[PDB]
Amino acid sequence: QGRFRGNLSGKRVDFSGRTVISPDPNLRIDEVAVPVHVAKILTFPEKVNK
Amino acid sequence: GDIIQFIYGGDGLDPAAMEGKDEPLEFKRVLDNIKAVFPCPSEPALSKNE
Amino acid sequence: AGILFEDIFDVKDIDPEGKKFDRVSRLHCESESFKMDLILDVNIQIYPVDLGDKFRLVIASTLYEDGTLDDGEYNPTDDRPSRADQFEYVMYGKVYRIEGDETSTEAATRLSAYVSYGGLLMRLQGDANNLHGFEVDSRVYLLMKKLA
């Protein structure tokens, strides 16, 4: 947990979630379902354009 | 800046794109696919020399 | 008249490797007029066959005897004079392989046509003179009728 291994090589970040998984065949292989509760928390900054 | 290999694996092929057993292509399957996808009934056959 | 082949076969074996399936059996048949061997897969539940039974078989390019080759699609509800009306068991398939006999290393004259009836195999082997008109990747019909 030092500076090199615990704070430089690998460090914790925000805008992340951890949840239990469950199978769903009705979704594409490149798609993934996200719960509404986590979706209301994780935000993406978009810039206003034309 | 020191060079480890003048060419990767002596040939420079991507291991992920390897379609055969350590070989880039399998000529038999490719030839069969070409024959099946493009069957020309209005053109004659070819001999060895041709 | 797109009749590519026509003969009368007799069954020499029903299941040489046992009853591998319930609704399908590996029929092995031999022609009486020519030297044409036939390995066939059919549905015995709707069309049962026996060892001592003979059947007239016809491989046709089209199902209409008038000569119209308009076979872009097939509607089962159609009612019109066709070849299937003169037969009992009709299967629509596609000839997909032509392979020469490998037993005769020289002066070989026997060829075999491999046709897929939706997974139901049909290998018709015999002299190449009888198989005239057969071309790979060609959609055709098979019509069989049992005889006395």
């Binding site: 239990v20 469950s22 379902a33 996200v34 719960p35 206003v48 | - | -």
Partner: protein, 397 residues
């Protein structure tokens, strides 16, 4: 202006598991929202993540930069990482409950009428496939009854619409290939597809699974791009469960019970093996025993006893496989290769093999014997680790 919008559909989002072995353990996908509370995705990506849906937690990271999002979509795209860089073998492919379903679908005994075939075909017309023509293939048998085989329904997955330029072609051998068929196998194990149309053979893990090359999805990826293979896999994963549910696939206690002839063969083999082991014991203890070159006499005896017990096991397994009738769910799963194998079936039904610890029989924990329930210096099969009975009949302590 910078607006912190909620996670909506279409956003590229990461998806990672805590134990990361290879690069495919963390991949970028397209985010979708659902009212439930779990991360749901297609099971075809379970092989890279090595997940099993037994309560394992999963991470999900959301980039905060357009450049990072684009790099995730391009490099870590699911459709662009269908193969591992280790040996080129595809990992995202069919899995359990999909291999068995497609195998039962592509069986030669399956025949569907117009209504059921139309329902099975329409079971995939969702999402981007809602704006394509069905292209119902012509029926095979039409005179007595109009029937569609399961192989045509499976080929529909490859080429759903008329305008689809996908022309898949493959020619390979299955797992149960006899060796002399060459598209004439009695077991129908020679896979042959021409122009995205299954001609013969039975689909299994050797062709649909992520085992090795010659996979149909691998050929689609290498010959027609990533999108076509992804669409084919989605159609398969949306078609196979519907048919598997509408048909029925169950295992019961009667599917693992032994037969009369199987019990007779097991008894005879056990008697013969016990007699041979007693002969070997008497030869080594009293007199001269043939010493195997490269080892001592006791190691030779141990090897001979192991060989005899394993011969008994293999013969009992062969007898059980011969006496087992078709439509058996464990046998079907072993044939299709979705889960289990012939060894597991033989161990559950016929006989359990020798319990091998570190590639050898059970060592003597006590003085000159494994357990006090056996005589000292006794090297009998059951006394050193052999299991005479099976899991169905019950195991001794």
């Amino acid at each position: 202006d910078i607006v912190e919008r909620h996670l909506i559909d279409g956003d590229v989002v990461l998806f990672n598991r805590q134990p990361s072995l290879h690069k495919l353990s963390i991949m970028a996908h397209l985010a979708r929202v659902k009212p439930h509370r779990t991360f749901r995705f297609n099971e075809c990506v379970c092989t890279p993540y090595n997940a099993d849906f037994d309560g394992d937690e999963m991470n999900l990271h959301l980039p905060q930069t357009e450049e990072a999002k684009a790099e995730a979509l391009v490099l870590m795209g699911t459709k662009a990482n269908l193969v591992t860089p280790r040996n080129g073998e595809p990992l995202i492919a069919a899995i359990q409950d999909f291999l068995t379903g497609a195998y039962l679908l592509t069986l030669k005994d399956t025949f569907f009428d117009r209504a059921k075939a139309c329902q099975i075909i329409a079971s995939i017309l969702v999402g981007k496939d809602e704006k394509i023509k069905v292209r119902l293939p012509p029926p095979t048998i039409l005179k007595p009854v109009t029937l569609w085989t399961g192989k045509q329904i499976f080929s529909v997955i490859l080429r759903p619409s008329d305008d689809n330029p996908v022309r898949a072609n493959l020619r390979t051998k299955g797992k149960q290939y006899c060796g002399k068929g060459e598209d004439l196998c009695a077991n129908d194990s020679y896979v042959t597809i021409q122009n995205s149309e299954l001609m013969s053979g039975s689909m299994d893990k050797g062709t649909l699974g992520s085992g090795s090359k010659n996979n149909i999805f691998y050929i689609l990826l290498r010959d027609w791009g990533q999108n076509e293979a992804a669409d084919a896999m989605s159609r398969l994963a949306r078609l196979a469960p519907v048919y598997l549910s509408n048909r029925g696939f169950s295992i019961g206690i009667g599917d693992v019970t032994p037969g009369q002839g199987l019990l007779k063969a097991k008894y005879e083999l056990l008697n013969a093996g016990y007699k041979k082991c007693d002969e070997y014991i008497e030869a080594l203890n009293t007199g001269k025993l043939q010493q195997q070159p490269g080892c001592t006499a006791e190691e030779t005896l141990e090897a001979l006893i192991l060989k005899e017990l394993s011969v008994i096991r293999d013969h009992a397994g062969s007898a059980c496989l011969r006496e087992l009738d078709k439509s058996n769910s464990p046998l079907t799963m072993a044939l299709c290769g979705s889960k289990g194998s012939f060894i597991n079936i033989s161990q559950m039904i016929a006989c359990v093999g020798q319990q091998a610890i570190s590639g050898s029989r059970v060592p003597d924990g006590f003085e000159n014997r494994s357990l006090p329930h056996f005589e000292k210096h006794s090297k009998l099969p059951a006394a050193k680790g052999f299991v005479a009975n099976s899991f169905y009949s019950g195991l001794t302590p």
